[model samples]
Target: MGVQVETISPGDGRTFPKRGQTCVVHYTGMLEDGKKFDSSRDRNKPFKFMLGKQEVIRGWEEGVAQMSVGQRAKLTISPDYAYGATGHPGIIPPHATLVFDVELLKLE
Candidate 1:
């Protein structure tokens, strides 16, 4: 069998942003090897963002807008759609498949 991706409810009352929308989110980022890279959850808080504005990663804006507050998801994102060819080395490798455990904390 192929690698099965895990997904939760794409909760109701959620709207995908065509324009940038402010939000606060908590997330755990990992490599395809499942090595933890970053985690906002461990920080005791969520991080802010302006979705769909290119202020954050494209994967973030698109992937997150599909969620509702308190919803959790496993996201598989390509580097081109995430960090691009100009990867943030050390923290992010070139053309890596990123996995994230994200929680939409609030949509402002």
Candidate 2:
């Protein structure tokens, strides 16, 4: 399935984060049926990773790459962009479509 993004807040800045740079974000993750699974907010810390470095999900690379700094958006990610068959145990189910409300906090 294609990724669907609903903009929560339009961030200031035109350039989106690129590969090789570190991207920091805060987010909540859930299943398509609105079941909560994971959340950065629960930990009170931003999820930080290097862009295009395969540190996170494929959808994150694709979806978050489209976001401007400080932007917040809800991303609907298909299995093709997520864990797919080898889903994260006890976290994401196999072939599950994920919904994430994410904010691009910073990039360095």
Candidate 3:
């Protein structure tokens, strides 16, 4: 699977974020070995980025697009969809598979 999305809590299913919209989310990212590499929750702040803007990883762009505001989900991303062979240095290792628990807080 390229990017596997598992919904933890279904929020407002009627509304979904559209392209060019800004998305605010809280998330924790871990490697396949369960090593947490990053978390917006730890910082007590949500991450914000424009949808479909390529400001984030490929997996994030695709996965978050499927989520609704207030929805929480798990995203299991393959290497190709994440950092791929050249993972983010000092954070993600090479060929690492990433897992993220994401909650879409707001879309504007």
Candidate 4:
């Protein structure tokens, strides 16, 4: 029904990003079959977006919000929390579940 998060490393427990704050992360996205679809690391650039702003998928927003800076985790996102039924053309298929290995690099 929602994102399933598996923490690889517990990050700094001191502070986490707030709703409107900007978050920077590096991630590798894959389908359920372990087929990589995209990656920020491959591009050699971390991705940045405003938290809780719907700038990314529901799973990402929810998952990343749970992370503190320097946290590394694996997120298993159900279809409803990802692209939904229609999905992203040419990249994702309908009702496809997604998996992402993510690292929270920074918050601003």
Record all residue pairs in model 1 with backbone atoms less than 3 Å apart, i.e. clashing.
Answer: none
Per-residue C-alpha lDDT of model 2 across residues 1-108, encoded as one tens digit per residue: 778888999987686998899999999999999999889999998889999889888899989999999999999999989989878888888988999999998899
* TM-score of each model, paired residue for residue: 0.81, 0.93, 0.96, 0.96
Q: How close is candidate 3 to the true structure, as a TM-score?
A: 0.96
Candidate 4 lDDT by residue in tens digits, 11-103? 997678898999999999999999999999999999999998899999999998888899999999999999999999999999999999999
lDDT score, candidate 4: 0.94
- After superposition, candidate 3 runs with Cα above 4 Å error: none
Give lDDT per model, in order: 0.74, 0.91, 0.94, 0.94
Cα deviation at 39, candidate 3, in Å, is 0.5
TM-score of 1: 0.81
lDDT of 1: 0.74
Off by over 4 Å in 1: 1-6, 9-18
RMSD of each: 3.6, 1.2, 0.8, 0.8
